[PDB]
Amino acid sequence: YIPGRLDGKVALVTGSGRGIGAAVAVHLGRLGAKVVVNYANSTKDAEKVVSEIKALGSDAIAIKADIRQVPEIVKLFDQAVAHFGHLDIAVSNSGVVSFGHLKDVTEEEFDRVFSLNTRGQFFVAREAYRHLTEGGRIVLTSSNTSKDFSVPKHSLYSGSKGAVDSFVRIFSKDCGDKKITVNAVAPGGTVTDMFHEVSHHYIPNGTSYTAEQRQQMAAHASPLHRNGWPQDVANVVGFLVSKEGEWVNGKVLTLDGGAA
Amino acid sequence: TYIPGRLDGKVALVTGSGRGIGAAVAVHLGRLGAKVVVNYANSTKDAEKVVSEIKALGSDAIAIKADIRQVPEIVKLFDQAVAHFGHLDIAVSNSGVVSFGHLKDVTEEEFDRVFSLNTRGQFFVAREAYRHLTEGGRIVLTSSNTSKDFSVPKHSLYSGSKGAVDSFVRIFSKDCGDKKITVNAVAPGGTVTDMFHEVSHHYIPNGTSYTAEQRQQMAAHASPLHRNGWPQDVANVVGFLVSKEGEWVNGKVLTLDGGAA
Ligand SMILES: NC(=O)c1ccc[n+]([C@@H]2O[C@H](COP(=O)([O-])OP(=O)(O)OC[C@H]3O[C@@H](n4cnc5c(N)ncnc54)[C@H](OP(=O)(O)O)[C@@H]3O)[C@@H](O)[C@H]2O)c1
Ligand SMILES: NC(=O)c1ccc[n+]([C@@H]2O[C@H](COP(=O)([O-])OP(=O)(O)OC[C@H]3O[C@@H](n4cnc5c(N)ncnc54)[C@H](OP(=O)(O)O)[C@@H]3O)[C@@H](O)[C@H]2O)c1
Ligand SMILES: O=c1oc2cc(O)ccc2c2oc3cc(O)ccc3c12
Ligand SMILES: O=c1oc2cc(O)ccc2c2oc3cc(O)ccc3c12
């Protein structure tokens, strides 16, 4: 046995075909876990994440499921178990970002965001509890903007992750009857497609800076003068879902390099 | 003739104000001098009583029916409030439902039942308030002590529903600043209403085997003050937040539990 390792464990990561999810999947594979890789759209990217987990000497499978659909989350979890035999770790990572002044937010934009970020995560957790083995791990995904960072025109997304914060604290109470811990990672600005999507909204007059200048300014948010990377979030998920991480339970961990 | 804390000339709207916390708020704002729009979805008779209560103490009020789950009915409610009284200054989002269940048992339908009102509803109330309200207005949403300060088994859905409200109001205050509107939430603990008696047993270790009175007595011991929370206690705080003097409290969630936390 090796401390911090996941030899003989089976894990599932939602939206692990790219971004943070991809780094989490690969890292769980590096730690010894067999991995179910979930995507909605990024097939080739998911097959590529599968390849890397195998390349490290583990096993992985790619399963297409749209996390907005609860019948699909159920089917995803059923198929995970039927393939690997059991499931120990579930990481809810899939999410979308949004910007808009309160006055312009539509019914459709609200639903687009909450169906995935909140409702989706809520039922990934449900299916995880239902399918997991005794002593398992569930990790959901929040945001530094949930509680720790206040950005104009960012109310919908912030709120969607605020629910997740309350969710995991109470989930830990219910999930304890199967000795399962429930936590959330709350990343700050982490360099992925999402970062490039909305970095201009996190900076005063963001439009008047290049993409690279915005990345450099984001790097100075942290007193460590660097950006957050998907590996940083992976590193923490790795510890949370290890035997050693058990006493962290029902907590939300903000991962912004000390920006807050 | 300006008295600090009063709301003469002001027009207020409280969702779900036919009964419960919202009725006390609506009545209270009326006592402070505001003209009030009393909202209901089902309690017609009780809404009429609130209207009458507000008229008997020297103010004016109207009862408007609107399901707060329906966004086009929120739009209409706000359109009618401004239409009837001339302008709108204060909006209190109060309408909510409680829910209990172990995570493993929570259905899509129950999820949607709770979130469409407690969260989505409150979100779009806030939106219609910003669109209709006057410069220097006030917006109060309703969170809960369970969102963040109190942790109860089998209570994840409801807790999260209000945890969303907590982040909403903080950011709302940023957007709403350009109309000089303040946005806050009140997060009550155990407050004696229909909702309270309906679920007090889910908050106490096998509260099934205590009476309804006994459970209220036990909730009273949560506060170091040794009494329950009442709708008037929330009304008292909302009353300050929406006054002139409460302006510097902005983008905040005020837990109102008599110091239980
Ligand atoms: N990046 C940041 O700075 C940052 C900061 C705070 C919080 N977060 C949170 O971190 C999580 C991941 O963010 P990211 O940076 O990896 O974003 P990203 O690079 O845009 O990736 C989003 C991921 O979500 C998946 N996804 C989207 N819709 C889905 C659906 N309907 N069903 C299943 N999966 C779906 C995507 O998969 P497909 O491409 O296959 O659709 C993709 O794998 C999100 O919850 C985000 O809110 C990110
Ligand atoms: N009581 C507590 O200990 C406590 C604690 C924490 C938070 N809260 C929150 O405080 C708020 C009020 O609580 P309460 O104790 O007064 O609840 P309550 O006694 O059950 O009253 C519910 C109120 O919401 C209205 N309502 C319900 N569904 C509605 C809808 N679809 N559209 C518009 N209005 C609707 C009801 O009016 P109709 O009868 O006409 O439907 C009624 O006026 C809620 O947000 C609740 O979550 C209460
Ligand atoms: O904290 C953040 O959270 C984010 C979350 C996202 O999903 C995307 C981008 C960011 C992001 O860009 C920034 C730029 C800055 O100069 C300072 C902070 C941030 C910041
Ligand atoms: O904090 C509370 O919030 C509530 C909210 C409701 O809607 C109904 C009941 C309660 C309630 O009952 C209790 C009994 C106790 O012994 C201690 C705390 C509470 C408590």
- Cα-based angle B118, A201, A108 (whole degrees, multiple of 5): 40
- Cα-based angle A231, A250, A229 (whole degrees, multiple of 5): 10
Burial annotation B143-176 (CB, 10 A radius, 16+ → b, else e): bbbbbbebebbbbbbbbbbbbbbbbbbbbbbbbb
Q: Is A129 on the interface with B (CB under 8 A)?
A: yes
Tokens read off for A156: 């919908």
Tell me which residue has tokens 């409280």: B14
**Ligand 2 atom index nearest CA of B188:** 6
Burial class from Cβ neighbours inside 10 Å (0-12, 13-18, 19+) for residue A250 reads middle
Residues lining ligand 1, CB < 6 A? Answer: A 14-15, 17-21, 39-42, 66-68, 93-97, 116, 141, 143, 187, 189-190, 192-195
Q: How far apart are the first and last CA of chain A?
A: 37
Q: Is A123 on the interface with B (CB under 8 A)?
A: yes
How far is the C-alpha of B155 from the C-alpha of B136, rounded, in Å? Answer: 37
Tell me which residue has tokens 């969630």: B253
Given this structure, which CATH class describes domain A1-260? alpha beta
Residue A46's closest CA among A73, A25, A17?
Answer: A17
Residue A151 has φ and ψ, to the nearest 5°, of -120, 130
Residue A225's CB is within 10 A of a number of other CB atoms, namely 10
Q: Residues 5-64, chain A: which have Cβ within 8 Å of B?
A: none
Tokens read off for B66: 């609107």
Among partner residues B120, B157, B171, which is closest to A110 by beta-carbon distance? Answer: B120
How far is the C-alpha of B133 from the C-alpha of B91, rounded, in Å? Answer: 8
All residues of chain B having their beta carbon less than 8 Å from the beta carbon of residue A126 are: 103-104, 106
Contact A36, A11 (CB under 8 A): yes
How far is the C-alpha of B62 from the C-alpha of B81, rounded, in Å? Answer: 9
Q: How was this structure determined?
A: X-ray
B191 forms bridges with which residues in the sheet? B229
Given this structure, which CATH class describes domain B1-261? alpha beta
All residues of chain A having their beta carbon less than 8 Å from the beta carbon of residue B161 are: 163
Contact A167, A217 (CB under 8 A): no
Nearest C-alpha of chain A: how many angstroms from B232?
27
- In degrees to the nearest 10, what's the CA dihedral of B9, B15, B17, B23? -60
Burial annotation A190-201 (CB, 10 A radius, 16+ → b, else e): bbbebbeebbeb
E strands, chain B, in order:
11-14, 35-40, 61-65, 90-92, 138-142, 182-188, 253-256
SS3 content of chain B, % helix, strand, coil (to 5): 50, 15, 40
B39 forms bridges with which residues in the sheet? B64
Rounded to 10°, the helix B231-241/B21-31 angle is 50
The dihedral of CA B54, B56, B61, B64: what is its sign? positive
What's the resolution in A? 2.5
Q: Known catalytic residue: B93? A: no
Residue B195's closest CA among B253, B259, B142?
Answer: B142
Q: Known catalytic residue: A161? A: yes
CA B62 to chain CA centroid, nearest Å: 18
**Ligand 3 atom index nearest CA of A97:** 7
Rounded to 10°, the helix A19-30/A230-240 angle is 50
Across the interface, whether the CB atoms of B103 and A110 are under 8 A apart is answered no
Q: How far is CA B131 from CA A191, B13, B78, B221, in A?
A: 36, 14, 9, 43
- Ramachandran bin of B153, using left for φ above 0, alpha for ψ from -120 to 50, beta for the remaining angles: beta
E strands, A59-191, in order:
60-64, 89-91, 137-141, 181-187
All residues of chain A having their beta carbon less than 8 Å from the beta carbon of residue B130 are: 102-103
